[PDB]
Scaffold this motif. Structure first.
Motif, PDB file in Angstrom:
ATOM      1  N   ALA A 213       0.820  -1.207   0.000  1.00  0.00           N
ATOM      2  CA  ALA A 213       0.000   0.000   0.000  1.00  0.00           C
ATOM      3  C   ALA A 213       0.855   1.259   0.000  1.00  0.00           C
ATOM      4  O   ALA A 213       0.562   2.218  -0.723  1.00  0.00           O
ATOM      5  N   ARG A 214       1.914   1.279   0.811  1.00  0.00           N
ATOM      6  CA  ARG A 214       2.760   2.464   0.869  1.00  0.00           C
ATOM      7  C   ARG A 214       3.547   2.648  -0.423  1.00  0.00           C
ATOM      8  O   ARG A 214       3.714   3.777  -0.896  1.00  0.00           O
ATOM      9  N   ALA A 215       4.029   1.553  -1.013  1.00  0.00           N
ATOM     10  CA  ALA A 215       4.776   1.659  -2.262  1.00  0.00           C
ATOM     11  C   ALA A 215       3.887   2.147  -3.398  1.00  0.00           C
ATOM     12  O   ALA A 215       4.302   2.988  -4.203  1.00  0.00           O
ATOM     13  N   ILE A 269      -6.240  -4.578  -1.290  1.00  0.00           N
ATOM     14  CA  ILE A 269      -5.405  -3.963  -2.317  1.00  0.00           C
ATOM     15  C   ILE A 269      -6.242  -3.517  -3.512  1.00  0.00           C
ATOM     16  O   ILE A 269      -6.114  -2.383  -3.987  1.00  0.00           O
ATOM     17  N   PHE A 270      -7.102  -4.398  -4.027  1.00  0.00           N
ATOM     18  CA  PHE A 270      -7.837  -4.093  -5.249  1.00  0.00           C
ATOM     19  C   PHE A 270      -9.245  -3.572  -5.006  1.00  0.00           C
ATOM     20  O   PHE A 270      -9.716  -2.730  -5.776  1.00  0.00           O
ATOM     21  N   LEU A 290      -7.377  -4.248   9.913  1.00  0.00           N
ATOM     22  CA  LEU A 290      -7.059  -3.092   9.087  1.00  0.00           C
ATOM     23  C   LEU A 290      -7.722  -1.863   9.701  1.00  0.00           C
ATOM     24  O   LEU A 290      -8.945  -1.833   9.861  1.00  0.00           O
ATOM     25  N   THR A 291      -6.910  -0.851  10.060  1.00  0.00           N
ATOM     26  CA  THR A 291      -7.375   0.340  10.757  1.00  0.00           C
ATOM     27  C   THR A 291      -7.860   1.397   9.773  1.00  0.00           C
ATOM     28  O   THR A 291      -7.583   1.318   8.570  1.00  0.00           O
ATOM     29  N   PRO A 292      -8.609   2.400  10.251  1.00  0.00           N
ATOM     30  CA  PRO A 292      -8.950   3.530   9.372  1.00  0.00           C
ATOM     31  C   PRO A 292      -7.738   4.180   8.734  1.00  0.00           C
ATOM     32  O   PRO A 292      -7.793   4.567   7.560  1.00  0.00           O
ATOM     33  N   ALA A 293      -6.636   4.307   9.478  1.00  0.00           N
ATOM     34  CA  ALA A 293      -5.411   4.832   8.889  1.00  0.00           C
ATOM     35  C   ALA A 293      -4.872   3.909   7.801  1.00  0.00           C
ATOM     36  O   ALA A 293      -4.350   4.384   6.785  1.00  0.00           O
ATOM     37  N   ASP A 294      -5.008   2.593   7.987  1.00  0.00           N
ATOM     38  CA  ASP A 294      -4.588   1.649   6.953  1.00  0.00           C
ATOM     39  C   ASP A 294      -5.398   1.837   5.677  1.00  0.00           C
ATOM     40  O   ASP A 294      -4.837   1.896   4.576  1.00  0.00           O
ATOM     41  N   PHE A 295      -6.725   1.924   5.804  1.00  0.00           N
ATOM     42  CA  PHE A 295      -7.565   2.114   4.624  1.00  0.00           C
ATOM     43  C   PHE A 295      -7.306   3.461   3.961  1.00  0.00           C
ATOM     44  O   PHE A 295      -7.436   3.585   2.736  1.00  0.00           O
ATOM     45  N   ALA A 296      -6.941   4.478   4.747  1.00  0.00           N
ATOM     46  CA  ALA A 296      -6.625   5.778   4.166  1.00  0.00           C
ATOM     47  C   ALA A 296      -5.431   5.682   3.226  1.00  0.00           C
ATOM     48  O   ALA A 296      -5.410   6.322   2.166  1.00  0.00           O
ATOM     49  N   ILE A 297      -4.430   4.882   3.591  1.00  0.00           N
ATOM     50  CA  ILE A 297      -3.298   4.673   2.697  1.00  0.00           C
ATOM     51  C   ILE A 297      -3.729   3.876   1.472  1.00  0.00           C
ATOM     52  O   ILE A 297      -3.359   4.207   0.339  1.00  0.00           O
ATOM     53  N   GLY A 301      -3.840   5.378  -3.194  1.00  0.00           N
ATOM     54  CA  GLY A 301      -3.117   4.867  -4.340  1.00  0.00           C
ATOM     55  C   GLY A 301      -3.961   3.831  -5.047  1.00  0.00           C
ATOM     56  O   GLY A 301      -4.964   3.345  -4.517  1.00  0.00           O
ATOM     57  N   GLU A 302      -3.546   3.496  -6.265  1.00  0.00           N
ATOM     58  CA  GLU A 302      -4.253   2.506  -7.062  1.00  0.00           C
ATOM     59  C   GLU A 302      -3.241   1.554  -7.678  1.00  0.00           C
ATOM     60  O   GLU A 302      -2.221   1.991  -8.219  1.00  0.00           O
TER      61      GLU A 302
END
Length: 475
Positions: A213-215, A269-270, A290-297, A301-302
């Protein structure tokens, strides 16, 4: 069966499986350097210290790509060759960066499009020693983000096709549930090992998800527009039919198994959604939320494409009785025959791999309907029956592998023309025989025979006819 003219096809390799030069050019040790050197061996006595010595022989290997008519070539970067200690604060190794810069230029000079995998199971050992590597979801995703960003900066003007992580299920499960892959952690292993099969695989899974997700967020925010490239992830997983098609529990078990294998990663991811409900129902608090901060990341991105590593299929049968806390497959039993005794597919050179082209077609259609992304077959290949005992002269004539390629190319063509699947490419595993991880050098997946006494490469017949097969289907 026809294939589109823009179909981007080639061959694939991985760094530790072919490169060698493990302590050369400034490289630091990976978790496989440590795992392949356990005494006594847990990798059939094999290590990757030399492997194919691709590090010193890439001009020859890339000349084979020209002889085989490939337009693309998928390889991986050794994280510990670029950043020997791996961490975001650790010094970079310019000589390691230079090596991969040379490979990229060598491919482009030959007119071959470089496809680059950032992570292919060779986590830097220092990150495992410092904080447990993939077990530390918080730390490892930050180190992978830096690592990915560095690769985008140095290589992204030339490399336009990125794969973040190769087969995260294997790294999670074989690395931290069964302990049969590096770093060899488990609580159900026959050896005395550290770890916890009830928790550690699910930590490693989420860590790889957020590392991806970060990449992808970095690439979407800073690189996709200027560099005009694309990025994906390579997911493996067998297709599963119900063991008894008339048993509703078997039909649900087959879907649950594929949810546990692929949906684990493909949902956040998708689809930008939580883990499949089946996983959270079975695993409860052991599946790191998976946290709200995780979903924000994830929503920043796509991911451009679904990378599919596919080899074989199985039958899934329902699970009776209480499900052990150490269970990771998703409460099923795996089978290679169904209720009628029908084999799932034809035997190959290794017992787990069967040629099931009809189920490969349904596999593509299901992945298309679930995640709605264009698909690149980032890995597909086989060893041939008895090839582990064949001489070079015997292995060079490989009708089984040719027929394997032909059958699965048919499945792709049908999936495109009948199921509406957007399959844009295909990478055969592998360019040459290499180290099959803990199985050693026995299994030969290459279209090129590798003599490990002389390191001489000898092309197999499939390597020469594959370009004819694509030209015929594109005719």
């Amino acid at each position: 069966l026809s294939l589109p003219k823009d179909f981007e096809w080639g061959f694939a390799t991985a760094a530790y499986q072919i490169e060698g030069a493990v302590k050369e050019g400034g490289r630091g040790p990976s978790i496989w350097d440590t795992y392949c050197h356990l005494e006594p061996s847990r990798t059939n006595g094999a290590n990757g210290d030399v492997a194919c010595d691709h590090y010193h022989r890439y001009d020859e290997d890339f000349d084979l790509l020209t002889k085989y008519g490939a337009k693309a070539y998928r390889f991986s970067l050794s994280w510990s060759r670029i950043i020997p200690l791996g961490g975001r604060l650790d010094p970079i190794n310019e000589e390691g960066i230079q090596f991969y810069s040379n490979l990229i230029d060598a491919l482009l000079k030959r007119g071959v499009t470089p496809w680059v995998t950032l992570y292919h199971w060779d986590l830097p050992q220092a990150l495992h020693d410092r904080y447990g590597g993939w077990l530390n979801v918080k730390e490892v995703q930050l180190d992978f983000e830096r690592y990915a960003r560095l690769c985008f900066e140095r290589f992204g003007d030339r490399v336009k096709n990125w794969i973040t992580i190769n087969e995260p299920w294997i790294q999670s499960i074989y690395g931290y549930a069964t302990g049969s892959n590096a770093p060899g952690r488990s609580s159900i292993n026959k050896h005395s090992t550290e770890g916890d099969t009830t928790t550690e695989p699910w930590l490693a899974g989420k860590a790889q998800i957020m590392s991806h997700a970060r990449a992808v967020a970095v690439y979407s925010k800073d690189f996709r527009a200027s560099q005009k490239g694309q990025i994906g992830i390579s997911l493996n997983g067998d297709y599963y039919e119900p063991w008894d098609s008339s048993d509703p529990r078997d039909k649900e078990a087959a879907e649950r198994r594929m949810e546990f294998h692929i949906g684990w990663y493909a949902n956040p991811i998708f689809l930008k959604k939580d883990y499949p409900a089946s996983m959270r129902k079975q695993l409860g608090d052991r599946l790191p939320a998976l946290t709200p901060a995780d979903f924000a990341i994830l929503n920043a991105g796509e991911t451009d494409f679904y990378g599919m590593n596919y080899y074989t299929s199985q039958f899934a049968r329902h699970y009776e009785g209480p499900v052990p806390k150490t269970d990771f497959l998703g409460a099923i039993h795996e089978h290679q025959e169904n209720k009628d005794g029908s084999p799932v597919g034809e035997e190959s050179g290794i017992f787990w791999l069967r040629s099931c082209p009809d189920m490969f077609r349904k596999h593509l259609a299901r992945v298309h309907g679930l995640y709605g992304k264009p698909i690149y077959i980032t890995e597909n290949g086989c060893p041939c029956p008895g090839e582990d005992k064949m001489t070079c002269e015997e292995a060079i004539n490989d009708p089984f592998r040719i027929q394997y390629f032909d059958s699965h190319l048919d499945s792709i063509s049908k999936a495109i023309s009948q199921d509406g699947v957007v399959v844009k490419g295909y990478f055969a595993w592998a360019l040459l025989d290499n180290l099959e991880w803990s199985d050693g050098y026995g299994p030969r997946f290459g279209v090129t025979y590798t003599d490990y006494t002389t390191l001489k490469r000898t092309p197999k017949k499939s390597a020469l006819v594959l370009k004819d097969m694509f030209a015929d289907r594109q005719r």
